[PDB]
Write a protein that binds this ligand. Structure first.
Ligand SMILES: *[C@@H]1O[C@H](CO)[C@@H](O[C@@H]2O[C@H](CO)[C@@H](O)[C@H](O)[C@H]2NC(C)=O)[C@H](O)[C@H]1NC(C)=O
Ligand SMILES: *[C@@H]1O[C@H](CO)[C@@H](O[C@@H]2O[C@H](CO)[C@@H](O)[C@H](O)[C@H]2NC(C)=O)[C@H](O)[C@H]1NC(C)=O
Ligand SMILES: *[C@@H]1O[C@H](CO)[C@@H](O)[C@H](O)[C@H]1NC(C)=O
Ligand SMILES: *[C@@H]1O[C@H](CO)[C@@H](O)[C@H](O)[C@H]1NC(C)=O
Ligand SMILES: [Cl-]
Ligand SMILES: [Cl-]
Ligand SMILES: [Cl-]
Ligand SMILES: [Cl-]
Ligand code: NA
Ligand code: NA
Ligand code: NA
Ligand code: NA
Ligand code: NA
Ligand code: NA
Ligand code: NA
Ligand code: NA
Ligand code: NA
Ligand code: NA
Lengths: 110, 158, 637
């Protein structure tokens, strides 16, 4: 679950009710502000049987979730945890400077 | 016209295909487009070098089909969209093989004839004929590409 | 189904950058150990990671983002309760280091009293869930509810060891104000980060305002730099007192239950929470704290809470307990006797009163403290009769005395309750015409009004005529409309019959005068078991009846055959006025002043030019002498 063939995706209205449980997510795949037309999206990869399930999620919301998760580690936060936290903060602000109506539109990646 | 013997996109995820490297290589994957589940067989081991990942379809009973058309709908991720191991490719290979019986999970690359190299949603179509045995398999070989194969439909005219 | 079942031997949650090639990893087992499975589930659900980006854009565009964070290079004010090496320290009960609280104690226990109960915040059904991730913290909760559930508003906040968060909800979208440590503020959600919402910042503390663009215009136009400076660069004590002044200002406008000025009440609540927070932070940032200093801080905080509940009756606070500090204060105040308290300097006896507030146990003030209060008020009143004015220090002392006397079980012994009646009567003797005019003038200018100048002996008096119409008649620009109203408001909430004399009256009482051997009721009508005097030379609708009742409900030896008040004509050569009351009344506006004559100097000072009595320039004032044996006369000439 290292490299995705469809890095850009559209957020579907049905996903909010059929989200996989957090402990079911195998991997998280983040895009670039220099990719996917600037659209801040992400891909959860979970698995049911032979089928790896890919869920298109909000980049801002998932980044803020991971920020909250890392911040609650406190003293136990390792070097790599803090590097992850700094990636999350930097990419949040980067996606924020270019947040537009064109950028909130993820349906183009259908 | 167009009698369809095989249509992967219309199977709704209830059609599983054989993968010779099981786990690595080709994987059956679900996405949701327009709030409907769209399935595909995808592979993207681009930073690893030698690959040779095979994906074999189910057994397709020939019937009256003598000259068949294979229609592939697939996406290929640009190799320059990776920070690298510059050993990735942007094509894959289409093979087929005829048999009077269903071999099941037995997979022998020796019996599969190369139809053609598939290269750039990409829509490709190849023709095979004449077929003589009771049924046939198709096969797809990945040599280090980042491909998502979304549709495979085989049919014959009139 | 279980989280361990879903993990299924997967060591890492891997986080891949599709176009950078680097990968981060979160250990599943470590995530579970440090952050419980319920917390992970609740964070994941509350995150709403499948929310459409247009919704996030609309959420972000709905906010008001400040110009630029203002950074003050200071560190705030220095901690005033630091223990000097000139005193002792104790870890933690008979060990009594004297009194007045001049020692130090380890703050580990008093900190555990502040944050003794945990609370879950930003729950699913709450509006703050829209911007904060749910979290569990040790904190103290505050909640005001103004108006009905259809039109009202709900204000609610939380003071934790690391931050303060307060919320204003227009339906009883929401506005949020936070103050605290920038690295410890609660986790925000996708559409906003903390740096862009930080209005003012210290080297230690920061102020954040998450305000909707359509929120109350005063919140948006409010200058939070000035608020932050007044919050940090002053000691928490004077800041608490400024917040008390602001609560008094809200009281003087009849705005305690008004839907309007809800953002003003919101700011006041934010500041009160910040005051509690700063006191608690001072407690935590130091290994040992000074007992009397912390007791003063706690007393000011408790007075702020109580006066806020007086204004807005729905004001609720849960968490801020002071059991151990209260026990320390209990040991300190048990030594203080009446003469000891009355001989202390004003500041030291104020400290004693604060410790009495904190160490009240089951709402029972020691009898020694009450007798000392009587002696203090006696000296204060005897001295008042020289200049007929009161400084702000004396009014602050009276405010402390009023805070101690309210919420105190009545005295069990007869003598101490009698002395309490005496100090009440002296407070009435200080609530004269001059005092009413001065208080009206002070309340007419709410800007220059502070908590000390707003306090008056009238708040501890036995006058019951202090209503808006009477006060209007007692006032000397056009601000008298406001000054008379607000004062009345603060009189209705801070005033106080349960002593003696049960021998059948109503609420038509103008005043009550409890002398040693007779009690006078100045009422609108006569009384059954009493000697009644009809007040002469007064307007029909201001008509008064002075009913004299003895405390043992027994009759007098003299028997008047007429309820007229006889007249006598034409200082002193001994003390004929001792143990009596001199009362003035206006022919149209009824009662003006009444003074208990405690000693010879009160008697002789009654005849000074600044005295409220015997002003020959007044063509419609009458003076009555109320003696201790039940006789009432009129002084003329
Ligand atoms: C908000 O209040 C602050 C209080 O300090 C004002 O800041 C000061 O303003 C004076 C002039 O009024 C300047 O001389 C100081 O240098 C300012 N100090 C700081 C730290 O900024 C601020 O001007 C007020 N804002 C508004 C809009 O009135
Ligand atoms: C109640 O006490 C007053 C004094 O407070 C008494 O007043 C005296 O009255 C007599 C005659 O009525 C006078 O000769 C005295 O000069 C008065 N004394 C003073 C100080 O003025 C009054 O008599 C007492 N009444 C009763 C019923 O005992
Ligand atoms: C938003 O930003 C993009 C740049 O990525 C720009 O092309 C687009 O026109 C902008 N849209 C609006 C509505 O400003
Ligand atoms: C999980 O991540 C840690 C570093 O966080 C790494 O040492 C370990 O090899 C990783 N294991 C797997 C199976 O990815
Ligand atoms: Cl790194
Ligand atoms: Cl299947
Ligand atoms: Cl499909
Ligand atoms: Cl591509
Ligand atoms: Na992706
Ligand atoms: Na979950
Ligand atoms: Na940036
Ligand atoms: Na398969
Ligand atoms: Na099979
Ligand atoms: Na769960
Ligand atoms: Na809250
Ligand atoms: Na003494
Ligand atoms: Na004085
Ligand atoms: Na009153």
């Amino acid at each position: 679950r290292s490299y995705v063939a469809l890095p850009c995706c559209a957020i579907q209205a049905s996903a909010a009710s059929t989200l996989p449980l957090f402990f079911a997510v195998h991997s998280i795949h983040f895009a670039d502000p220099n990719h996917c037309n600037g659209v801040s999206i992400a891909k959860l990869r979970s698995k049911t049987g032979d089928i790896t399930v890919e869920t298109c999620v909000n980049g801002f919301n998932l980044r803020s979730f991971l920020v909250a998760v890392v911040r609650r580690l406190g003293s136990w936060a390792s070097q790599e945890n803090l590097r992850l936290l700094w990636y999350l903060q930097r990419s949040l602000t980067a996606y924020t400077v270019g947040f537009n109506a064109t950028t909130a539109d993820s349906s183009i990646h259908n | 016209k167009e009698v369809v013997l095989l249509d992967f996109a219309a199977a709704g995820g209830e059609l599983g295909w054989l993968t010779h490297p099981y786990g690595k290589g080709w994987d059956l994957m679900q996405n949701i487009m327009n709030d409907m589940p769209i399935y595909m067989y995808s592979v993207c081991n681009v930073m690893s070098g030698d690959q040779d990942n095979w994906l074999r379809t189910n057994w397709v009973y020939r019937g009256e089909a003598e000259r068949i058309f294979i229609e592939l709908k697939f996406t290929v991720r640009d190799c320059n969209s990776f920070p690298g191991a510059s050993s990735c490719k942007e094509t894959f290979n289409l093979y087929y093989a005829e048999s009077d019986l269903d071999y099941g999970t037995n997979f022998q690359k020796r019996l599969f004839t190369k139809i053609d190299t598939i290269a750039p949603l990409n829509v490709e179509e190849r023709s095979v004929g004449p077929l003589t045995r009771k049924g046939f398999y198709l096969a797809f070989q990945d040599i280090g590409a980042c491909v998502a194969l979304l549709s495979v439909r085989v049919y014959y005219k009139k | 189904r279980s989280a361990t079942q879903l993990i299924n031997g997967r060591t890492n949650l891997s986080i891949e950058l599709e176009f950078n090639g680097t990968s981060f990893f979160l250990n599943w087992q470590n995530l579970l150990n440090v952050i419980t499975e319920p917390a992970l589930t609740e964070l994941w659900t509350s995150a709403e990671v499948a929310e459409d980006l247009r919704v996030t854009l609309k959420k972000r565009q709905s906010l008001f983002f400040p110009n630029k964070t203002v950074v003050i290079s200071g560190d705030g004010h220095r901690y005033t309760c630091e223990v000097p090496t000139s005193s002792q320290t104790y870890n933690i009960y008979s060990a009594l280091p004297g009194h007045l609280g001049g020692f130090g104690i380890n703050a580990r226990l008093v900190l555990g009293d502040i944050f003794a109960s945990k609370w879950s915040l930003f729950a699913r059904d709450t509006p703050e869930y829209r911007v904060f991730y749910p979290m569990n913290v040790m904190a103290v909760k505050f909640s005001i509810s103004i108006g009905n559930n259809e039109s009202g508003v709900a204000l609610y906040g939380v003071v934790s060891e690391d931050f303060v968060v307060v919320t204003l909800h227009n339906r009883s979208t929401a506005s949020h104000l936070l103050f605290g440590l920038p690295d410890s503020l609660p986790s925000l959600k996708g559409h906003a980060t903390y740096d862009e919402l930080t209005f003012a910042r210290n080297a230690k503390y920061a102020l954040v305002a998450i305000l909707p663009k359509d929120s109350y215009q005063t919140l948006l136009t409010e200058n939070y730099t000035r608020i932050f400076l007044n919050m940090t660069e002053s000691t928490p004590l004077e800041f608490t007192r400024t917040i008390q002044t602001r609560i008094v200002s809200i009281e003087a406008r009849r705005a305690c239950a008004a839907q309007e000025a809800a953002p003003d009440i919101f700011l006041v609540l934010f500041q009160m929470l910040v005051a509690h927070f700063l006191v608690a932070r001072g407690i935590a940032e130091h290994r040992f704290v000074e007992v009397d200093c912390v007791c003063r801080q706690y007393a000011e905080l408790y007075f702020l809470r109580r006066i806020s509940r007086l204004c807005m009756p729905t004001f609720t606070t849960v968490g801020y307990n002071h059991t151990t500090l209260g026990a320390v204060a209990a040991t300190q105040i048990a030594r203080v006797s009446a003469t000891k308290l009355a001989s202390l300097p004003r500041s030291s006896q104020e400290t004693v009163l604060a410790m009495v507030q904190l160490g009240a146990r089951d709402g029972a003030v020691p009898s020694s403290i009450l007798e000392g209060i009587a002696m203090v008020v006696e000296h204060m009143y005897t001295a008042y009769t020289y200049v007929y004015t009161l400084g702000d220090t004396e009014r602050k002392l009276m405010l402390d005395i009023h805070t101690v006397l309210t919420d105190s079980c009545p005295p069990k012994d007869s003598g101490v309750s009698e002395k309490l009646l005496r100090t009440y009567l002296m407070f009435t003797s200080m609530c004269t015409n001059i005092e009413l005019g001065e208080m009206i003038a002070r309340f007419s200018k709410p800007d220059s009004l502070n908590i000390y100048r707003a306090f008056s002996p009238c708040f501890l008096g036995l006058r019951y005529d202090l209503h808006p119409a009477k006060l209007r008649a007692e006032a000397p620009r056009t601000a008298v409309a406001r000054g008379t109203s607000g004062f009345a408001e603060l009189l209705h909430a801070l005033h106080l019959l349960i002593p003696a004399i049960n021998c059948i009256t109503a609420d038509k009482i103008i005043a009550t005068v409890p002398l040693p051997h007779v009690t006078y009721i100045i009422s609108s009508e006569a009384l059954s078991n009493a000697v009644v005097y009809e007040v002469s030379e007064i307007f029909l609708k201001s008509a008064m009846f002075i009913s004299a009742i003895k405390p043992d409900c027994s009759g007098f030896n003299f028997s008047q055959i007429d309820r007229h008040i006889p007249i006598v004509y034409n200082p002193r050569r001994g003390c004929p006025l001792c143990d009596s009351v001199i009362m003035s009344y206006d022919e149209s506006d009824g009662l003006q002043s009444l003074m208990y004559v405690t000693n010879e100097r009160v008697q002789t000072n009654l005849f000074l030019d600044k005295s409220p009595f015997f002003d020959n320039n007044n063509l419609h004032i009458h003076y009555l002498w109320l003696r201790d044996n039940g006789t009432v006369v009129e002084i003329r000439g």
